[PDB]
Amino acid sequence: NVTGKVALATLGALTGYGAFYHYNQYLNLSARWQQIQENIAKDQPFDVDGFDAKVYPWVRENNVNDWEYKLVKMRGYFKDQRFFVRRKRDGKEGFLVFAPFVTAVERVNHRLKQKDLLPVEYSVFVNLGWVPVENKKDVELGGEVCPPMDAPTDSTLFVNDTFTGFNPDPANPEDTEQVTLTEITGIVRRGEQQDILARRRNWNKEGIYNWVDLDYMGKIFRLFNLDAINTAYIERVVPSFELYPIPATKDTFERPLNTPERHSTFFNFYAATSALSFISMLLL
Amino acid sequence: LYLKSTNYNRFDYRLKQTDWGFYINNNSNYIQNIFSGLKYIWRGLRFWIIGLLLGLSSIYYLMYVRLLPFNKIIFAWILVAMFLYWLLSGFVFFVKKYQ
């Protein structure tokens, strides 16, 4: 009786506080999402060229929240390996496809004739798109994500870049320095974290991945700039229309786990629980 | 369980058939001293449980880390055990005899 009343009061207080917290989070997330949608609809990509392509602005200043969901443009060559993360888009099961993207190359060998040293590659992870579970076998190794960038019209631009080290020369006399540059545009997004209750848990040994673990993805692919990989990743966004993976557009880029819909559902659940607890307390 | 149970066991009749004056036949109920064999079993293995646990765990670990072929090494260990045991048994014989 009295113990039941005490338990009901405690449960009602806890659930009411939870509902209030989720409602405030819903308001804040809705406001931020409106701001993000307006900024994306503005469509002024930030060109990541020069020094910015070697150490990225969100790595140098360590402000990914200031650069989150942020339109950027960068050029480089994708590496062959692809990474799949289990995800659902538009209510159907599929996989997010990630590829390494080398935005800067550094050569540190001075015995060029004697030694053929591997270059130091600076890369970031690019979310190519989403492919359904049926068509995961249709993703090809070393596929062409974007058509290669056009050759520049300035004859002085056919030398190795000072910072990125890339030579935009289709016919390079230095065969070992021949690179093909493709230019992508996307949105900077931060990496994900484990949430077992959200069914985002990955078994690395079995090969089952449910959340974007940038640290593991960088380690498994033997990439170099592990910290600049862990900081964030670029989700490729095609201009207006989106065969596999299917790239995200301005209206269908992958939604974060924390959403106003999710917080509204939590608020409704907690408010209902608190109301029921108070009704039962009044009855008793 | 022993309401109508007689005192004598098989060993009592066997003893009655022998000239062993140092052993006598039980004449009272054994309920007081029931399950004493477990007590003596514990006393027999009392100082050996910890030592045997540590020794067997150590032996199994040392075998497992090297993945030795069981048949060959067990044959070798049987040979070495016979060697050492017969040496020590001869020495124990000498120690016991000279009392």
Partner: protein, 206 residues
């Protein structure tokens, strides 16, 4: 039609079969063309990386008797059965002596000195010992009956063992009339014919 006659001779049962050898040589060529595809001998052996999950590497008691004890023939199997029978009789006698129920008019496990001293734990140990011995004896009996049915009724043999029996190490029995006598006397047409078929290519549908 010379090639046709040679092939028909290859498929004749009296070609690769000599008395006292494997009767499967009566259909040898047929069996060969089904197994030696592309001239390759399939390796049925299992590749094991040790994690100390097994020590004796005997899958069952039948494997133990066949391979560890090398009871490949029937006299060996019957000798092992006699040994197992003696062991089982001795184990039964030991269990009946240590827990004399039904021997001197004793009808209850309680009315034994073994139960007085050690209680139900001793009875459980004796039951486990007798059960293990009876289980192993049953397995040995099944092995011996199977070997009797195979070697004595069906007249099967351990054919590599029979081959080793026929030649006592340093005999001169390499004959031209016998295709299986040596490697030099095995005709090339048989080698070509037994390797004509090809393995299927798997569909990697997983």
């Amino acid at each position: 039609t010379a090639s046709e006659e040679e092939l028909k001779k290859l498929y004749d049962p009296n070609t690769f079969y000599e008395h006292g050898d494997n009767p499967a040589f009566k259909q040898f060529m047929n069996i060969a063309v089904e197994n030696l595809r592309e001239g390759k001998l399939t390796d049925h052996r299992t590749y094991v990386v040790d994690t100390y999950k097994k020590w004796m590497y005997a899958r069952n008691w039948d494997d133990f008797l066949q391979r560890d004890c090398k009871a490949i023939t029937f006299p060996r199997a019957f000798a092992l059965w006699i040994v197992g029978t003696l062991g089982m009789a001795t184990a039964s006698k030991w269990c009946r002596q240590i827990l004399p129920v039904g021997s001197h008019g004793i009808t209850k496990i309680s009315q034994t000195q073994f139960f007085h001293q050690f209680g139900p734990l001793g009875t459980l140990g004796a039951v486990g010992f007798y059960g293990l011995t009876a289980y192993l004896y049953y397995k040995t009996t099944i092995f011996t009956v199977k070997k009797f049915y195979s070697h004595c009724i069906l007249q099967e043999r351990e054919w590599i063992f029979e081959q080793e029996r026929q030649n006592p190490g340093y005999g001169e029995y390499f004959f031209k009339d016998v295709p299986l006598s040596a490697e030099e006397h095995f005709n090339d047409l048989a080698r070509g014919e037994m390797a004509k078929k090809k393995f299927e290519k798997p569909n990697h549908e997983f």
